[PDB]
Amino acid sequence: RRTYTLTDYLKSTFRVKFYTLQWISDHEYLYKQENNILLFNAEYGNSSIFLENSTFDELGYSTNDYSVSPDRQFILFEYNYVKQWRHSYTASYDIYDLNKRQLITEERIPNNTQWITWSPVGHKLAYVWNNDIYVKNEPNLSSQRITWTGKENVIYNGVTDWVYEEEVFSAYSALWWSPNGTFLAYAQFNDTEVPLIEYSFYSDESLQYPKTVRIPYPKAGAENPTVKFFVVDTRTLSPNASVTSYQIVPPASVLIGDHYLCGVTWVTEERISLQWIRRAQNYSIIDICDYDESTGRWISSVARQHIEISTTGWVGRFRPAEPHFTSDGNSFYKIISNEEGYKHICHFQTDKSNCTFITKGAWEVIGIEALTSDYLYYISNEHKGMPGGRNLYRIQLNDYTKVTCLSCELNPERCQYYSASFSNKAKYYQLRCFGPGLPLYTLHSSSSDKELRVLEDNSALDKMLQDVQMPSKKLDVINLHGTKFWYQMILPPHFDKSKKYPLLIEVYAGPCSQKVDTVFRLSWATYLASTENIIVASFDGRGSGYQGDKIMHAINRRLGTFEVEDQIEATRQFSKMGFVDDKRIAIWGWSYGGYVTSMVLGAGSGVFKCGIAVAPVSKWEYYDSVYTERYMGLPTPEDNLDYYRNSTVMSRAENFKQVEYLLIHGTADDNVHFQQSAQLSKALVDAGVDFQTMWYTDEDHGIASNMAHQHIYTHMSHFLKQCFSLP
């Protein structure tokens, strides 16, 4: 039998199918099948053609994305996709009238449109062009300019700046329409005082001189972008009328210093919830503002303010959890840490300070999925006490004792990791099972919890993998300093416990990380285990997520310590097992995992023979302010300079003399600048350490271009085989 090869992984010969749908009502959803947009009815099972694939072929361009207006009268077509950062992109847009089956030719959406969104009702459009907001009440009508402040690299209206995109919102959008489209709320980011990150972009071979990319990027302790939040009354939008807008300022408790807007949630047409966090990120406030009909003001009240603090570390996981409001908006449900340090759902009253915990246990709620008048639906890792598992649960709002696991025992051996998507009134839901077995996509009714149908079962993939010697993924526990921690091992086929196998540690180990889960993956590790007979292990120690604040906050204000030390002690234990060759142990990782790899290799433990660090952080002062300060505080002698100073990979340069090290980085990395790797290599050169490098010209943080992706894993495979004396 054949094995899962490098070619198999790189050329994606074994395809994992999925089922992406867009709920457009309480019982209907849109699905793209063979480039046709089909409208499926969950209530009866039947489907109809919403838009024929023949309309796509006549557009004159490839349709990578579509958006149907909520009233189903128009469709937005995305073409000329020009990717910027992780979520940002500029594109050209066409509006197709579904009523008259014609394409809008007059007053079109301009070229280089940064972001575009329909109103939640009707067919109003709000788009961002040249860092300014424009509103089209009708797709054939002229757009109305909302903002005049927009300036390239300086002022951003309706779109995030670099750091808000990467670390705060995890989205390029900073526009929020009110439920009935009366109001268009937006954030304004001012990057005037933010220093620029500059690096060379070489472009195509024909470009004689390289260009200098300049991005306002705040590094740890640097000047941060400022934010302003406005609510525009779209009703007064007329060509010869001024823009009616009200600026909502944060509460005094956060307004006294540097802050961030971390969340926006429309409650009703006349009530908006704003979530602000201080720059320290151990203090968060929810300010619920009400519209005054007589003045047009959005008034805040002390009674409507909800504080969330952390004394042991930071607020939330990567940000405070979002409030989930009732239809009336008089109460909300939010994930907060309890007295025991576990992240659970608390029920809050909009005008009262006290909350009531509706969930409890030595496990955590991942997210609130849906909320009806009677039920709340959520994802948690409660099942079998596995933090690497995910299941859908429903809690009765009048009786918190009545909790049902909707997904737990559907396919207990095949399915332990779930995600869910609910219909408009949470009447139906799609369940997404990601592993340990082949991913399974199913549809359910919320009333009966009956499985209506199997949307995708990956049967084509099952047939393909029968002819291949696939590796086995084993999940287990080990005890480190009296605490039980989880590990996983991708084991080679025909695994013999008497034989001694080489071991490769795959690491992330970042604050709130989870490398150990039940997700099915056709990864590079699959190839290493299947073809090269390498055990690929991962471990979640101190600082990892979804196991309580005690474990998560263990690395507070001391990144590069416990999580690094735990990777070494876990490997020492793995090597004690008689099936591991102690002479052939390697460690590798990307981003935070590249930093951990490097801090592990610089620890001088003697455990690891070699390691591969891909685009790693080398010194926390070089990384962005939002992420870094959340865990480290400020790099001032008054705050945490000392722990910033002794957590650099450079300070461990001398120990690298005992290992084989491969350092990889993309030159056009906007996130973890090439500077990080360039400063690390320099220190190793100064320490007299031999190591290997690999720069990837014009590649960003992902090193995800088709040719670069293939090259990096082929390079990493050669290095590992050299290190493990493998042909």
Ligand X SMILES: Cn1c(=O)c2c(nc(N3CCC[C@@H](N)C3)n2Cc2ccccc2Br)n(C)c1=O
Ligand Y SMILES: *[C@@H]1O[C@H](CO)[C@@H](O)[C@H](O)[C@H]1NC(C)=O
Ligand Z SMILES: *[C@@H]1O[C@H](CO)[C@@H](O[C@@H]2O[C@H](CO)[C@@H](O)[C@H](O)[C@H]2NC(C)=O)[C@H](O)[C@H]1NC(C)=O
Torsion sign, CA atoms 630, 636, 642, 648: positive
Nearest approach, Cβ of 31 to ligand Z (angstroms)? 13
When asked if residue 696 is in the footprint of a copy of itself (CB under 8 A), the reply is yes
* 204-223 positions binding ligand Y, by CB under 6 A: none
Q: Between 243 and 680, name the residue whose CB sits nearer to ligand X.
A: 243
Tell me, yes or no, if 575 is annotated catalytic. Answer: no
192 touches ligand Z by CB under 6 A:
yes
Exactly one of 669, 677, 681, 700 is catalytic; name it: 669
Least distance to ligand Y, CB of residue 30, Å: 11
Q: From CA 528, how far away is CA 52, in angstroms rounded?
A: 43
The smaller minimum CB distance to ligand Y, of residues 30 and 601, is found at 30
Closer residue to ligand Y (CB): 31 or 375: 31
Task: Establish if 707 lies at the interface with a copy of itself (CB under 8 A).
Answer: yes
Radius of gyration of the chain from Cα atoms? Answer: 26
Which residue in 105, 242, 311, 725 binds ligand Y (CB under 6 A)? 311
Residue (of 430, 451, 432, 420) closest to 29 by Cα position: 430
Using the 8-state DSSP alphabet, how is residue 164 labeled? I
Cα 327 versus chain centre, distance = 28
> What's the rounded Cα separation, in Å, for the pair 366 and 364?
6
715 is an interface residue for a copy of itself by CB under 8 A:
yes
State the nearest-atom distance from the C-beta of 232 to ligand Z, in Å. Answer: 16
Give the x/- contact pattern for a copy of itself in 629-648, rule: CB under 8 A.
Answer: -------------------x
Position among 158, 329, 510, 545 found at the interface with ligand X (CB under 6 A): 510
Residue 300 to residue 285: CA distance in whole angstroms: 12
Q: Is 63 in the site for ligand Z (CB under 6 A)?
A: no
* One-letter-per-residue 3-state SS of 380-423: ECCHHHCCCCEEEEEEECCEEEEEEECCCCCCCCCEEEEEEEEC
Residue ranges in 201-260 that form contacts with a copy of itself under rule CB under 8 A: 202, 205, 208-210, 212, 219, 222
Active site residue 591: yes
Output the smallest distance, CB 33 to ligand Y, in A.
8
Question: In the 3-class helix/strand/coil scheme, how is 501-552 assigned residue by residue?
Answer: EEEEEEECCCCCCCCCCCCCCCCHHHHHHHCCCCEEEEEECCCCCCCCHHHH
Q: Give 53 or 84: the residue with its C-beta nearer to ligand Z.
A: 53
Q: Which is nearer to ligand Y, 253 or 679 (CB)?
A: 253
CB of 671 to ligand X, least distance (A): 4
By CB under 6 A, name the one of 5, 53, 523, 655 that touches ligand Y.
Answer: 53
Q: Is 602 in the site for ligand X (CB under 6 A)?
A: no
Question: Considering CB distances under 5 to 8 angstroms, the limit depending on partner class, which of ligand Z, ligand X, ligand Y, none binds residue 166?
Answer: ligand X
- Region near ligand X per CB under 6 A, out of 76-84, 238-246, 269-277, 475-483: 238-246
Nearer to ligand Y, 183 or 631 (CB): 631
For residue 646, state whether it binds ligand Z (rule: CB under 6 A): yes
- In whole angstroms, how close is the CB of 710 to a copy of itself at the nearest point? 7
| Active-site choice (407, 513, 591, 598) | 591
Is residue 314 within 8 Å of 631, Cβ to Cβ? yes
- Of 266, 508, 574, 661, the one binding ligand X by CB under 6 A: 508
Alpha-carbon distance of 455 to 433, in angstroms, equals 11
Q: How many C-beta atoms lie closer than 10 Å to residue 706's C-beta?
A: 9
| Amino acid sitting at position 425 | K
The residue among 134 and 674 lying less far from a copy of itself, judged by its C-beta, is 674
Please choose, out of 123-131, 241-249, 363-371, 639-647, the segment that lies near ligand X by the rule CB under 6 A.
241-249
Question: Within positions 272 to 301, which residues make up the interface with ligand Y, using CB under 6 A?
Answer: 280, 282
Do 230 and 248 meet the contact criterion of CB atoms below 8 Å apart? yes
Which of 529, 683, 720, 723 is close enough to bind a copy of itself by CB under 8 A? 683
Q: Are 26 and 424 in contact (CB under 8 A)?
A: yes
Q: Which of the residues 117 through 176 are near ligand Z (CB under 6 A)?
A: 149, 155
Type and span of the H or E element at 7: helix 6-10
Q: Return the residues of window 161-180 that contact ligand X according to CB under 6 A.
A: 166-167
Q: Tell me if 34 contacts ligand Y by CB under 6 A.
A: yes
CB 196 within 8 A of CB 214: yes
How far does the chain reach from its first CA to its final CA, in angstroms?
19
The amino acid present at 148, given as its one-letter code, is W
Q: Which of 559, 557, 556, 640 is nearest to 599 (CA)?
A: 559
Per-residue binder mask for a copy of itself (CB under 8 A), 316-355, x = binder: ----------------------------------------
Cα–Cα distance for residue pair 107/18, rounded to 1 Å: 37
Query: Token pair for residue 270?
Result: 């006349």
Q: Identify what 593 binds: a copy of itself, ligand X, ligand Y, none; CB under 5 to 8 Å per kind.
A: ligand X
CA 661 vs. chain centroid, Å, equals 29
Residue 58 CB neighbours (<10 A): 8
Secondary element (H or E) of residue 614? strand 610-614
**Alpha-carbon gap, residue 7 to 647, rounded angstroms:** 38
What are the contacts of 311-314 at 24+ separation with CB within 8 A?
Answer: 311/282, 312/341, 312/549, 312/553, 312/556, 313/282, 313/549, 313/552, 313/553, 313/556, 313/631, 314/281, 314/282, 314/511, 314/553, 314/556, 314/630, 314/631
- Binding part of the chain for ligand Y, among 30-38, 367-375, 437-445, 447-455 by CB under 6 A, reads 30-38
374 binds, among ligand Y, ligand Z, a copy of itself, none (CB under 5 to 8 A by kind): none
Per CB under 8 A, contacts with a copy of itself among 590-619 are 619
Q: Which stretch binds ligand Y (CB under 6 A): 35-43, 72-80, 169-177, 258-266?
A: 35-43
Q: Please tell me whether residue 318 binds ligand X under the rule CB under 6 A.
A: yes
Q: Clarify whether 701 is annotated catalytic.
A: yes
Is residue 195 reached through a cis peptide bond, with omega within 30 degrees of 0 on the bond before it?
A: no
What's the half-sphere exposure (Cβ side, CA atoms, 13 Å) at 565? 12
Q: Could you please report the per-residue DSSP string of 313-334? A: S-SSSSSPPPPEE-SSSSEEEE
How far apart (Å, rounded) are the C-alpha atoms in residues 460 and 541? Answer: 37
Binding positions for a copy of itself, rule: CB under 8 A: 195-200, 202, 205, 208-210, 212, 219, 222, 619, 621-622, 648, 650, 667, 673-675, 678-679, 681-683, 685-686, 688, 690, 692-698, 707-708, 710-711, 714-715, 718
Binding positions for ligand X, rule: CB under 6 A: 148, 166-167, 240-243, 318, 508, 510, 590-593, 617, 627, 671-672, 701
Binding positions for ligand Z, rule: CB under 6 A: 34-36, 53, 149, 155, 190, 192-193, 560-561, 646-647
Binding positions for ligand Y, rule: CB under 6 A: 34-36, 39, 41, 44, 46-48, 53, 149, 155, 190, 192-193, 239-240, 280, 282, 309, 311, 633, 639
Catalytic residues: 591, 669, 701
